[PDB]
Design a protein around this ligand. Structure first.
Ligand SMILES: [Zn+2]
Lengths: 615, 554, 107
């Protein structure tokens, strides 16, 4: 409010002490370091009660500190001469603000990922004199919290000290439950990759320890239910992010033992009537996410083993499942889906109210939360529920190019669709009509669709294929070893000779009067599309003799001497496609054309793609 | 203000939970549980077995003898005694099932997987001398099952593929080998979970000798490699170097270690890292030692990770007749296995990129072990890591940017991490870095640095607008990924308050730049700068450095 | 039982039923040549994780009761499982009479 202007001047004061030029990382300790008092002020104006509740002015407050540490890696390793570096004093002070903002998932994710930036790449300047001086300290405060966890058994524990001991344990869990991208190999128990860390078994120890603590304690507090839902949120978040996380298929897990751990953990949670609170979708989210992981894979039997549900039925009540209404609704939906795939589909039928298959229901109703949405702006919840309802329908499978054309031209496939020439008609009428000058993004989407669709045109005569059964390219997107230019075909079809998509390409793109300004984006996209077309297709004659560079070799010259290196290194890639054909490069004349072209660049920055183009 | 205790804390019987987990333990892919498959097993050559009141008759149900032992020792022992009782008893069981000429060893994979489930259930109570005994048992067990990892590179010209096309014995001992190495990995991670004062009970010379033999057996040179057991064998060394780093008395361990063990490991690591990852010939059988290719005839999940598709899953179930007591295997004709989606190839590439990440990771770890110089901190991690960095940058730029596979980001994270592997080797370990070997790699090192020094120009990005067009071009797969995560699998990814999608439109864009090979992070550009510019070695002269500065401008 | 070699569950493992080609009452699927005691121990381990003691008991009581029932009411079926099922059910009942419920006793 009054100090957001102070933060706006403060980021300018940070960028002022950058360097004499724009080149600044400055990893070492220089013998002005006057930003140390500001570094102190970043956290001494933070532990306060008034406007930390506001989101963005707190976000910029911690983000200016993030940019300061981003441009100054020597600030962690400055040797705060008590016994260590200052980063150990940084972590617990950071933890105080995170435990004041323990509950807001945005506020803790935004803090933990920037701490991951502060630890993963900043310690790498020093390593062994500092890596073990902080990866020990993480386990030191971890050991302190799990040590203090045990004296609540003997009952002499406090109340708020109990609370923030549990909460600090929770946040120390949550940091290390992150993905590999946030915390890399900077911390010595996350040193091992392949979904398989030292944090795995130590975490499976400490979660059983806090289960033992929860069975030891006896408290029905509302806030205890609130912090009780947090740990099951953490146990589903620990197993979600270690999945492989593919494009549109369900993200496959890596460790069936970690799966069984989270399943049996939340099952033992629910068995002891744990974690009940009003209007709280958290357990429902966990159940639905894990069932979404275990829809129809091999782990579905593992789900029905290590989380059984059959025994809480009570069919003959409006209160169907006991615990908390929306979570019990989610449980009913999971039970319904399990029953749906257990029963044969002849008993099932789809009612076309929500178009989902449903069996012969009940003598009573008992089917009100099965298919209805149940939410108070619970958007991820109903999308989970609608995926659970929709995935059984055996509908059209998710595909890359089909998702992209549904994103771009919505509702195209209310027709034949997989018929080939009509999507050519739609892309052609778009690339003739629906642009004036504002689609400097949408036309790039159009041409990347054209680049994949030209590959699809090449995939006929490869009389089997279809719109759906083509995720990626069997020639450009997959690759083999050795010389890739043996796999390409000499007598492949021509671009202008056969492919009407290249006729369209030459119509708009290769004849547009403002090739000199498309954009870097649209030049890159037309380079990608031309790359795929001349990969799958023979390029035309580059020169007949009357000047006459064929509007694409012209694009090679335009993007080849370009100011940016990316379009240089992309425009070099389409060059050997010119170097091979029959009936164009049969007697090595396009060969000598490219030779005397490559002999004609003494420009210093074009040496890189020049030499690569030679190779 | 004290929280009240629970007067009837029902501590569950942990050995009952462990026993129940044993009984319902089923591997991923087969129909029956593992115990029940063992119930479907006999052994008609060992006409009687007994070690310690573990009587097995001739046509006896083997898993019935197991569950007799289980229920008997449940009433008697506490948890660790129950564990290592099962460990040594099933170990002796596996032992004399192995050492017999006419005996089929179909029980052995399920016994090994059973024993793995025994070990990994409670590592807190599992005892390290039992780990040592079981560990040495698996090591000499694999030197018993010797000829599996020693099938030759090429067949003869008259090595006919006329054959009964059988797969049952091959499936048996592939599962034996793979589950064995998986168990070695499990032993060492639970031994890692054992505290940082308690390793000398596990470690002696025989540990290192047996693993050194089986490691040379695993990362083979003149034989066809099994990519499965390569994963396990390098993860073992990862756990080894990790606990060497994370103990205080590393001196006793490294004094137990002869440097021959190091320099025999590191050569096979170099020969592994100098292989290639190409999707179109993963599941093809091709030239050796260049293509970690994950052969079709061993394609299942494994005990820790789910490495493939597990095409062999129902074949594990059809290993047995399931209505009969037998020891001979049920039929698998070998070529009935085997065009829909090379996403299988892409995820196998994802595994192999994580593998090469682990290789350079343990290189990093051993450098941090030997901060001081030694026989193996000797400069070849400039050569081999620089060759890897240079090739995975050059044909990255040539082949991958615009190939829209999910593996692009991790493949260009490999170079991002081995840059630091070059970097701290350069800065902190310059003392051994010989004048000859830098000239052995003078081209590729300086060129690999320059491929980051070229990224300080910054004339591609400069905004938000066209960069998201470029991530539509190449990074629509991460768009799919983040829409699935933002729509299902993240608590913080809903009702975004206009500071956190700001972070998104920062980080997706720097990520897709890092894919597009221009605009790396400035710290990585600085780390490439402070080697080439640094006067610790005359990489360039000043009249040769400007010949590279002009190749940006400057 | 006193006199036979194997345990009762283990004898049930040696049992199938090739006339009732499928049985199911409440997720108690028994196939045609399925090992019957294997289906029992599937039920046992499944209801162990879920139910408390009396619910586990009368679950086993009614399930094995329905099992004995349709093994009985069939003309071509041999009823060799039935004595071991009855003795099994007896062992189920008499173990803890304190928790065993009287309506289950009545049924
Ligand atoms: Zn293509």
């Amino acid at each position: 409010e009054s100090h957001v202007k102070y933060l706006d001047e403060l980021i300018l004061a940070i960028k002022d002490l950058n360097s004499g030029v724009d080149s600044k990382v400055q990893i070492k300790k220089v013998p002005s370091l006057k930003i140390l008092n500001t570094l102190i002020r970043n956290l001494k104006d933070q532990r306060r009660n008034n406007i930390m509740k506001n989101d963005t002015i707190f976000s910029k407050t911690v983000s200016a500190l993030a940019l300061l540490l981003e441009y100054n890696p020597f600030l962690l390793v400055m040797k705060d001469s008590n016994g260590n570096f200052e980063i150990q004093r940084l972590i617990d002070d950071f933890l105080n603000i995170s435990v004041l903002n323990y509950d807001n998932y945005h506020r803790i994710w935004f803090m933990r990922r920037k701490l991951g930036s502060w630890c993963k790449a900043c310690v790498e300047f020093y390593g062994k004199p500092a890596k073990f001086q902080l990866t020990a300290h993480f386990e030191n405060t971890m050991n302190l919290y799990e040590q203090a966890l045990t004296e609540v058994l003997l009952g002499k524990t406090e109340l708020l000290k109990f609370y923030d001991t549990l909460k600090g344990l929770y946040i120390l869990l949550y940091w290390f439950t992150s993905e590999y991208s946030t915390f890399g190999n900077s911390i010595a128990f996350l040193d091992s990759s392949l979904g398989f860390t030292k944090f795995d078994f130590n975490f499976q120890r400490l979660i059983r320890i806090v289960l033992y603590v929860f069975d030891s304690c006896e408290l029905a507090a509302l806030e205890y239910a609130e912090i009780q839902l947090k740990y099951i949120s953490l146990v589903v978040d620990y197993v979600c992010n270690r999945t492989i996380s593919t494009a549109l298929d369900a993200p496959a897990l890596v460790c069936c033992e970690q799966l069984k751990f989270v399943l049996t953990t939340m099952h033992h949670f629910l068995d002891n009537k744990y974690g009940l609170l009003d209007n709280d979708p958290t357990m429902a989210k966990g159940i639905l996410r894990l069932y979404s992981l275990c829809i129809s894979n091999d782990f579905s039997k593992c789900f029905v083993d290590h989380f059984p549900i059959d025994q809480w039925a009570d069919f003959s009540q409006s209160e169907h499942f006991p615990f908390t209404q929306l979570t019990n609704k989610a449980l009913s939906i999971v039970y319904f889906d399990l029953k749906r795939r257990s029963l044969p589909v002849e008993a099932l039928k789809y009612d076309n109210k929500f178009n989902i298959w449903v069996y012969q229901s009940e003598p009573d109703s008992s089917l009100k939360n099965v298919t209805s949405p149940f939410d108070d702006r619970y958007k991820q919840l109903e999308k989970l529920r609608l995926l659970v309802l929709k995935k059984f329908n055996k509908t059209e499978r998710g595909t890359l190019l089909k998702y992209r054309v549904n994103q771009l031209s919505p509702g195209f496939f209310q027709r034949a669709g997989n018929d080939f020439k009509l999507i050519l008609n739609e892309a052609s009428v778009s690339i003739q009509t629906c642009f004036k000058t504002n689609n400097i993004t949408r036309l790039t989407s159009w041409t990347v669709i054209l680049g994949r669709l030209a590959c699809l045109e090449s995939e006929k005569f490869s009389s089997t294929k279809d719109m759906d059964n083509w995720y990626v390219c069997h020639l450009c997107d997959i690759e083999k070893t050795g010389n890739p230019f043996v796999r390409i075909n000499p007598n492949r079809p021509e671009a202008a000779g056969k492919s009407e998509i290249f006729r369209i390409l030459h119509s708009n793109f290769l004849s547009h009067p403002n090739i000199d300004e498309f954009s870097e984006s649209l030049l890159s996209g037309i380079l990608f599309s031309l790359h795929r077309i001349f990969s799958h297709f023979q390029p035309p004659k580059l020169t007949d003799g009357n000047g006459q560079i064929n509007k694409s070799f012209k694009l090679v010259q335009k993007c080849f001497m370009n100011s940016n290196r990316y379009l240089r290194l992309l425009s070099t890639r389409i060059i050997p496609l010119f170097n091979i054909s029959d009936s164009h490069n049969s007697e090595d004349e396009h060969t000598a054309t490219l030779i005397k072209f490559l002999q004609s660049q003494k420009l210093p920055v074009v040496k890189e793609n020049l030499v690569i183009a030679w190779t | 203000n004290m929280v009240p205790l629970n007067p009837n804390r029902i501590i569950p019987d942990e050995t009952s939970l462990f026993l129940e987990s044993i009984l319902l333990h089923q591997i991923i892919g087969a129909d029956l549980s593992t115990i029940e498959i063992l119930n479907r097993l006999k052994l008609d050559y060992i006409t009687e077995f007994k070690f310690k009141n573990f009587v097995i008759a001739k046509g006896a149900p083997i898993g019935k003898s197991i569950v007799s032992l289980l229920l008997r020792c449940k009433k008697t022992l506490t948890l660790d005694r129950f564990i290592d009782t099962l460990l040594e008893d099933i170990a002796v069981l596996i032992k004399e099932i192995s050492v017999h000429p006419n005996e089929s060893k179909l029980a052995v994979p399920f016994l090994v997987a059973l024993m793995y489930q025994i070990v990994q259930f409670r590592p807190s109570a599992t005892h390290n001398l039992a780990l040592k005994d079981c560990f040495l048992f698996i090591c000499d067990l694999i030197r018993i099952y010797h000829h599996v990892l020693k099938v030759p590179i090429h067949e003869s010209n008259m090595n006919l593929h006329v054959e009964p096309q059988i797969f049952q014995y091959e499936l048996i001992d592939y599962l034996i080998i793979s589950y064995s190495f998986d168990l070695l990995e499990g032993i060492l991670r639970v031994l890692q979970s054992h505290p940082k004062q308690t390793y000398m009970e596990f470690f002696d010379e025989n540990i290192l000798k047996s693993f050194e033999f089986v490691y040379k057996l695993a990362l083979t040179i003149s034989y066809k490699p099994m990519v499965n057991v390569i994963f396990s064998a390098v993860e073992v060394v990862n756990i080894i170097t990790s606990i060497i780093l994370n103990m205080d008395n590393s001196s006793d361990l490294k004094s137990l270690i002869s440097g021959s063990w190091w320099r025999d490991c590191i050569t096979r690591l170099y020969a592994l890292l100098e292989k290639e990852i190409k999707s179109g010939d993963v599941y093809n059988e091709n030239v050796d030692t260049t293509t970690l290719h994950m052969s079709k005839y061993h394609d299942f999940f494994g005990l820790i990770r789910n490495i493939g598709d597990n095409e062999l899953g129902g074949l594990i179930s059809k290993l047995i007749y399931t209505d009969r007591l037998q020891s001979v295997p049920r039929v698998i004709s070998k070529e009935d296995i085997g065009f829909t989606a090379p996403i299988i190839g892409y995820k196998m590439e994802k595994w192999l990129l994580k593998l090469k990440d682990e290789v350079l990771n343990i290189f990093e770890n051993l450098l941090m072990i030997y901060g001081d110089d030694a026989t193996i901190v000797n400069g070849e991690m400039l050569i081999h890591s620089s060759k890897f960095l240079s090739r995975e940058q050059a044909l990255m730029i040539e082949r991958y940017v615009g190939q829209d596979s999910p593996n692009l980001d991790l493949r260009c994270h490999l170079i991002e991490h081995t840059l630091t592997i070059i970097y701290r080797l350069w800065k902190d370990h310059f003392k051994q870095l010989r004048e000859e070997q830098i000239k052995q790699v003078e081209s590729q090192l300086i060129m690999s640095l320059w491929r980051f020094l070229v990224c300080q120009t910054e004339t591609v990005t400069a905004n938000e607008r066209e960069m998201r067009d470029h991530r539509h071009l190449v990074d629509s797969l991460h768009d799919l990924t983040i829409k699935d995560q933002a729509s299902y699998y993240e608590d913080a990814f809903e009702d975004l308050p206009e500071y956190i999608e700001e972070e998104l439109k920062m980080q997706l864009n720097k990520r897709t730049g890092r894919i597009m090979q221009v605009k790396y992070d400035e710290k990585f550009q600085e780390m490439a700068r402070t080697i080439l510019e640094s006067k610790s070695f005359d990489l360039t002269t000043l009249e040769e450095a400007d010949s590279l500065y002009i190749s940006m401008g400057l």
